[PDB]
Write a protein that binds this ligand. Structure first.
Ligand SMILES: O=C(NCCN1CCCC1=O)Nc1ccccc1
Ligand SMILES: O=C(NCCN1CCCC1=O)Nc1ccccc1
Ligand SMILES: [Zn+2]
Ligand SMILES: [Zn+2]
Ligand SMILES: [Zn+2]
Ligand SMILES: [Zn+2]
Lengths: 197, 197
């Protein structure tokens, strides 16, 4: 009769957000993005993407860490696996490439929980939390994981991004603002028993 | 690097849906419903509600079992805990009262997973997957659980209800049809590794 996973949260003021050099996107436009997805599909099949959900609290209110590219899109930290790369090692590699320190001290990433799966049927924006009817060759599969933070840490934010802490109410029913994966994080996080340290 | 929970699904044709006498709602109207919630809040505080999510497949496509009252609302099987009642024993009690057999043979209910939490701030329809800002006395707290079915079973459906199997695509982004809890089941179920037996 205690079936919820227990997750420790720490205050946002426990974390230090330093700076490092810009990290440029792999694609210069939407059209370039879907051309490269089409080219790689022909060589190695479906794109395998992993993303991390990192939580803090302020005054006992959970907040998700988002990376905002300039003043455009909000992103979760993550990216593309290489062929034959383990999903959990890969997400740890990508989070170190995005938020890892200038002084080369390693973060202690802890990943123990899957919180969802999304599939892209075509070389187009629509994504779904299932494989849609009649679709045998999805073009992309995304896997989301909860990343348990340590009590304190220093993250290095690439200079072209801002790290922003968003409360759950601002994400909720806000697909226009955040799109369909980030806007459904409130519902996906509701199963956890958060401890406010 | 295998962090997903594994869940066995069986075909819908493995299950027999018999009939029994009507099960009438506790409240004859929305106004009667929120009057009784207001009366009980004053005596025992917040309403504690539990609901079950029961999954099958047909042709390897997952479907959620829904109870439709005549041709109005779709419902998950569930209901109200009594004061000091355990959540998991309570859901097993309520599922036996709704779908338990006329011949008094017990179902073997297996409940091992929480899939979400919803909170009602006021004596009004709005519900959220978090406690909203400034709300210290929520009026209702709902807990949803995944109910693992056995390979075969006979359920007795009250005569005033139809048991319906809905695919995930029909629930997805369909709050008008199903409301905000049932329409977010696709996203909440995406973390499971379903086995299609
Ligand atoms: O690439 C990321 N997430 C995977 C999903 N994608 C791909 C294109 C845009 C997007 O959100 N995230 C990310 C965040 C900061 C720096 C670098 C990468
Ligand atoms: O009561 C149920 N679920 C809890 C949430 N509520 C309360 C009012 C309507 C609603 O969906 N479910 C249910 C299903 C079949 C028969 C009897 C009960
Ligand atoms: Zn405070
Ligand atoms: Zn895949
Ligand atoms: Zn078949
Ligand atoms: Zn509560």
């Amino acid at each position: 009769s205690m079936l919820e996973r227990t997750i420790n949260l720490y205050p946002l003021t426990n974390y230090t957000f330093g700076t490092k050099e810009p990290l440029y996107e792999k694609d210069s436009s939407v059209a370039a993005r879907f051309q490269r997805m089409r080219e790689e599909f022909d060589k190695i099949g479906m794109r395998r993407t992993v993303e991390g959900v990192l939580i803090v609290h302020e005054h006992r209110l959970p907040h998700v860490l988002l990376l905002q590219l300039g003043t455009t899109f909000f992103k979760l930290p993550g990216g593309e696996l290489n062929p034959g790369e383990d999903e959990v090692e890969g997400l740890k590699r990508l989070m170190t490439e995005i938020l890892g320190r200038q002084d080369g001290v390693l973060q202690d990433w802890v990943i123990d929980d899957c919180i969802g799966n999304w599939w892209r049927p075509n070389f187009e924006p629509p994504q779904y939390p299932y494989i849609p009817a009649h679709i045998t060759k999805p073009k992309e599969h995304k896997k989301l994981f909860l990343v348990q933070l340590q009590e304190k840490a220093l993250f290095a934010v690439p200079k072209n991004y801002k790290l922003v802490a968003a409360p759950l109410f601002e994400l909720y029913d806000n697909a226009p603002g955040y799109g369909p994966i980030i806007s459904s994080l409130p519902q996906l996080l509701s199963r956890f028993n958060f401890i406010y340290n």
